[PDB]
């Protein structure tokens, strides 16, 4: 199978530098022209750069927005594609995709260009309060507050509870994100059985497994 | 640079019905070699883009025959004969006839389904949070349709507009409904200063709002 | 030698 894996995305200060890598396998890397395509959060696609194969003497092309700041390169002996980015601007914030021609796309690597600092989240359990006796279906949650940069992932019971799970996209308010996740289960598997939210923030190496426990005074 | 204009911005289609989307260029995409390098791509929620059509009308391998591309010069069209649940996403046109290689702004295809009222749940601040000096009140509004909804927060009866964060999920992969989370953030001092906390949801499914509440004084 | 081409771009 064809696979393209980008590495290197992370938080960097405006005017800073960063180099991305893309590892190719399952196809003839050395006979293909490669591209970098980016997507700012919640925006459309924008072509960034192109590099041809050795038969075309590794010709390079750049979008006006990155020309002279970015350098596309390749290492055929290692099946690697690179993107060196200098003098980074907040408008360079995006998911960066490695692409074989216009057809094989990687999963992407996130580049956040910001003066804000890496901050771990606070993980708060959301359990039913005062009222609600037995409504046959119970809704529980987890509030993941004040982290930076993106992303954060939430699973319930290590991925065993997959149905009735709603994980809400993060919203940025004054250099910090807040995300929430809900789970709806029958009133029989809880409190009787275990409901735990597993939250990960890889930028701060944070892993928090919060068990949901009833209030009722 | 060649400007690619896609219309409509969004459309809402019932599964089984046709869809048609447009891509217009600021200049002819007919290249010097007599070929027209117009591509169509689909990006499903949380996935990487994938190419569906190249050279205006040619289908990539594994792309169903429900998709047809057509056009010439400056006017191009992608048509879906009968939409399936898997067609949900953002469609982009990408021209390769002129340098630099420009994209259209995207067309978001949404799945039309029946109306459904939200199921509302209210949540008090946790002890883990109250200890830090802050207090958040959460309301989840589950499995509703259409997307447009209004949440109103009330503290002891009076409307509060500040310290509110709202977030919507993508359409559910199984039933196409939306869900929404509404968080009210107050300081620990202000939260203890009042008793009843209420979230009110106004949706097209009802003339009267859905109201969920809790008071710190009762358990 | 010989460049693969998915026909996405011209030239
Ligand atoms: Ca040309």
Residue numbers in the entry:
A (entry chain H): 1 to 217
B (entry chain L): 1 to 219
C (entry chain K): 1 to 11
From the paper:
Patients with cChHD possess high levels of antibodies against the carboxyl-terminal tail of the ribosomal P proteins of T. cruzi (called the R13 epitope). These antibodies, as well as the murine monoclonal antibody (mAb) 17.2, are able to cross-react with, and stimulate, the ß1 adrenergic receptor (ß1-AR). To study the structural basis of this cross-reactivity, we determined the crystal structure of the Fab region of the mAb 17.2 alone and in complex with R13. In the present work, we report the three-dimensional structure of the Fab fragment of mAb 17.2 determined by X-ray crystallography, alone and in complex with its cognate peptide epitope, providing a description of structural changes that occur upon binding the antigen.
The fine epitope recognized by patients with cChHD was located at the C-terminal end of the T. cruzi ribosomal P2β protein (TcP2β) and was named R13 (EEEDDDMGFGLFD). This highly antigenic acidic epitope bears similarity to an acidic motif (AESDEA) on the second extracellular loop of cardiac β1-adrenergic receptor (β1-AR). Despite this extreme heterogeneity, it was possible to determine a common reactivity profile where Glu3, and to a lesser extent, Asp6 and Phe9 were essential. Indeed, the C-terminal end of the human ribosomal P proteins has one single amino acid change in the third residue (Glu3Ser), a change that diminished the affinity of mAb 17.2 for the corresponding mammalian peptide by about two orders of magnitude. Finally, we discuss the relationship between epitope mimicry and bystander activity of anti-R13 Abs on the β1-AR using our crystal structure of the Fab 17.2 in complex with a model of the human β1-AR constructed from the turkey β1-AR structure that was recently determined.
